[PDB]
């Protein structure tokens, strides 16, 4: 489900699902 | 950045996992 255009909350949602308890960091600028 | 690689263009599992802790 990750091989598509993921923008906004949908991208953040994908990171949440994929990374799991590892967590993630979201940096839209840098 | 992640927006350029996953929003502007098609994302991939490799690129997502680069942002996991």
From Swiss-Prot, chain B:
It comes from the Eukaryota. Disulfide bonds join 6-11. Transmembrane segments: none annotated. This is Insulin A chain. The gene is INS.
């Amino acid at each position: 489900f990750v091989n598509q255009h993921l923008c906004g909350s949908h991208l953040v949602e994908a990171l949440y699902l994929v990374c799991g308890e590892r967590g993630f960091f979201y940096t839209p600028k840098a | 950045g992640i927006v350029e690689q996953c929003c502007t263009s098609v994302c991939s599992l490799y690129q997502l996992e680069n942002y996991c802790n």
